[PDB]
Amino acid sequence: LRVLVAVKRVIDYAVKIRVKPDRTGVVTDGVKHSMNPFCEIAVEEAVRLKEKKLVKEVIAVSCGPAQCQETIRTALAMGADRGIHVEVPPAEAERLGPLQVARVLAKLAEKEKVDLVLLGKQAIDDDCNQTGQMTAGFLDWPQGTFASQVTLEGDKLKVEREIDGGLETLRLKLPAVVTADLRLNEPRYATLPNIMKAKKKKIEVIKPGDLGVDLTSKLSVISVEDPPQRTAGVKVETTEDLVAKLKEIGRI
Amino acid sequence: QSTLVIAEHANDSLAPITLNTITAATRLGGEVSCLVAGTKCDKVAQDLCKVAGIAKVLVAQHDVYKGLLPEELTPLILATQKQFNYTHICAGASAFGKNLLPRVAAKLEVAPISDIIAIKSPDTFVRTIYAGNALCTVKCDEKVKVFSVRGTSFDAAATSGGSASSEKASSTSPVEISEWLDQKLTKSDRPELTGAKVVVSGGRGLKSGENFKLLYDLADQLHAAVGASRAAVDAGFVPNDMQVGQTGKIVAPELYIAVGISGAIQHLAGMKDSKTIVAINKDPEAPIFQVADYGIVADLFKVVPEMTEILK
Numbered sequence: 001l002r003v004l005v006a007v008k009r010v011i012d013y014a015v016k017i018r019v020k021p022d023r024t025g026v027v028t029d030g031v032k033h034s035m036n037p038f039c040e041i042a043v044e045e046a047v048r049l050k051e052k053k054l055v056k057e058v059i060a061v062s063c064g065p066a067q068c069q070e071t072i073r074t075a076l077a078m079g080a081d082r083g084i085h086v087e088v089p090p091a092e093a094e095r096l097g098p099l100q101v102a103r104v105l106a107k108l109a110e111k112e113k114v115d116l117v118l119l120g121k122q123a124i125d126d127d128c129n130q131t132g133q134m135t136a137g138f139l140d141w142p143q144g145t146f147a148s149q150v151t152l153e154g155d156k157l158k159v160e161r162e163i164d165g166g167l168e169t170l171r172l173k174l175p176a177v178v179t180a181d182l183r184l185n186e187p188r189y190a191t192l193p194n195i196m197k198a199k200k201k202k203i204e205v206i207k208p209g210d211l212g213v214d215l216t217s218k219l220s221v222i223s224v225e226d227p228p229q230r231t232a233g234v235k236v237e238t239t240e241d242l243v244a245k246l247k248e249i250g251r252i
Numbered sequence: 253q254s255t256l257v258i259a260e261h262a263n264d265s266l267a268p269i270t271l272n273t274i275t276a277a278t279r280l281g282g283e284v285s286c287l288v289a290g291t292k293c294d295k296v297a298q299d300l301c302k303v304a305g306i307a308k309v310l311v312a313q314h315d316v317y318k319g320l321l322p323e324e325l326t327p328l329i330l331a332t333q334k335q336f337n338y339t340h341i342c343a344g345a346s347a348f349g350k351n352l353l354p355r356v357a358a359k360l361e362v363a364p365i366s367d368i369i370a371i372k373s374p375d376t377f378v379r380t381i382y383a384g385n386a387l388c389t390v391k392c393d394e395k396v397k398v399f400s401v402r403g404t405s406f407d408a409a410a411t412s413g414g415s416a417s418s419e420k421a422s423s424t425s426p427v428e429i430s431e432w433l434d435q436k437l438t439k440s441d442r443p444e445l446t447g448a449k450v451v452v453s454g455g456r457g458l459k460s461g462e463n464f465k466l467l468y469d470l471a472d473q474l475h476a477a478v479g480a481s482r483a484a485v486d487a488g489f490v491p492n493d494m495q496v497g498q499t500g501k502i503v504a505p506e507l508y509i510a511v512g513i514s515g516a517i518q519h520l521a522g523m524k525d526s527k528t529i530v531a532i533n534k535d536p537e538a539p540i541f542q543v544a545d546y547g548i549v550a551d552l553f554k555v556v557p558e559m560t561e562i563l564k
């Protein structure tokens with residue numbers, strides 16, 4: 001198999017974000033960014049399949065500004081064979097959403113002749129949980145979302161998914177699209193020598209236009225604002241007081 | 253302006269999230285239709301007919317809908333769209349809704365909107381980003397508005413007072429590129445986490461699964477649902493469907509009790525809209541105290557049992 005893995009560069013999950021006072025977005029300048037946690041898990045899974053000799057090649061791809069190349073390098077250091085950067089200028093990247101990314105991944109899938117596309121189940125910044133499903137729809141391939149277990153059984157895929165009341169097992173005919181949930185695995189850490197060799201692996205750069213993808217969007221963010229703040233609470237000294245407090249306010 | 257709601261259900265029972273989605277749909281100010289698909293839809297369709305606000309209920313019953321696979325439902329939905337030309341298509345932002353709606357939008361070639369918390373107009377919605385730390389108002393100029401609805405942001409529609417006609421639906425040919433094999437549901441007697449009025453959650457502070465028993469006992473006295481943090485799930489204390497947060501379930505009960513949970517950004521994302529939040533943590537510097545209306549800096553192994561007793 002040939003696998004296509006999509007990784008997104010986002011503000012580090014541990015960072016306390018700040019909304020711009022002009023209410024056009026969140027502060028990104030001088031803020032720590034890193035690979036989206038869900039994407040890391042997709043990469044780790046692609047690499048494990050290659051290590052089990054079930055997958056021949058792993059191509060990592062990221063859409064966005066020049067900084068995304070570091071994210072791709074990370075994927076390479078984890079074990080991806082080669083990277084593809086679909087470059088978009090910082091200004092236009094602000095308008096980049098699941099629809100455009102899905103269109104780009106769909107073209108790349110058939111262009112590269114991959115049998116499997118792995119994505120994370122959502123990006124921690126936009127929280128959309130859409131790109132994998134849209135890519136599958138565009139390609140008319142089956143989808144295995146929120147996957148916590150994946151098994152290649154010849155020309156089919158066995159996927160166990162996280163659903164609201166438990167787990168669910170599907171079987172999908174290849175080629176397919178799978179989106180990774182946190183439970184799928186624990187991502188490995190790229191070691192120094194691997195980060196060094198990763199600098200030798202070359203990243204191919206292309207533009208959406210070269211793929212025939214139009215970045216036109218009919219979605220427009222009107223504003224980005226801080227959610228309403230909560231009134232500071234009180235600390236109770238005893239369990240008895242806690243219950244008393246809850247009782248008088250009608251919670252108990 | 254016509255709205256199609258994709259009803260979620262299983263075992264002749266309608267998923268409650270569908271009721272909240274109907275309320276959001278009526279806010280659009282158009283006629284509301286409801287599509288019920290599956291292997292057995294006769295009971296649910298009848299119930300939906302009584303739901304206030306619905307004008308039409310389309311029934312697509314067939315064995316091909318076993319497992320409600322997106323690849324099989326999508327062609328059904330596109331067919332219904334060609335025939336009735338809806339301006340809005342929605343579903344509750346559950347695992348089902350999130351799985352299905354983005355696939356439908358791609359086929360329609362429109363950009364979908366996820367987990368909306370408010371409707372300002374038929375084309376302007378509010379949703380959260382960055383684990384609920386920012387509110388994003390979006391203007392959607394798509395020919396068809398495809399979006400999922402946050403269940404906790406809309407009241408459930410009354411299950412009575414509605415009059416709707418049930419109609420058989422534009423049923424398609426099977427795709428068969430995917431197949432449902434089996435499932436493993438977490439059988440529990442406690443009330444559903446998402447609809448619970450009171451929720452009791454535990455984190456890494458419980459040290460073991462056997463200790464979670466304390467939360468179940470407390471939960472009983474409060475007729476509460478029990479939730480958890482990632483730490484409790486990864487440690488094996490409880491199953492992953494019990495996780496509250498950005499990667500799990502979003503709840504907004506009247507009372508949320510966080511026990512042995514630090515209050516990390518990703519956990520707050522799924523419970524910071526609860527009416528009253530109580531924290532039981534031995535660390536006075538735990539982030540959870542910043543959002544807790546009432547907090548007690550103490551050992552949960554002491555406080556929890558006491559609270560259960562005081563409650564008896």
Ligand SMILES: Cc1cc2nc3c(=O)[nH]c(=O)nc-3n(C[C@H](O)[C@H](O)[C@H](O)COP(=O)(O)OP(=O)(O)OC[C@H]3O[C@@H](n4cnc5c(N)ncnc54)[C@H](O)[C@@H]3O)c2cc1C
Nearest residue numbers: 455456457481482497498499500512513514519533534552
């Ligand atoms: C992309 C992503 C998504 C995530 N999604 C989620 C999500 O949906 N939900 C979620 O919860 N997490 C999620 N996380 C994980 C999150 O970042 C934290 O790791 C997690 O919430 C920590 O869990 P905790 O508070 O149980 O553990 P800790 O942070 O270790 O806290 C344990 C707490 O227990 C207190 N304590 C210990 N012993 C006692 C005692 N005897 N009495 C009283 N208090 C005691 C300690 O003081 C401490 O405050 C996600 C992470 C990522 C990267």
Ligand SMILES: Nc1ncnc2c1ncn2[C@@H]1O[C@H](COP(=O)(O)O)[C@@H](O)[C@H]1O
Nearest residue numbers: 006007063119120122123128129130131
């Ligand atoms: N700009 C991007 N570049 C590459 N992959 C992306 C990009 N945006 C989203 N994705 C992929 O789609 C998954 C889900 O993202 P989203 O639909 O935005 O929640 C992410 O985890 C990535 O695998």
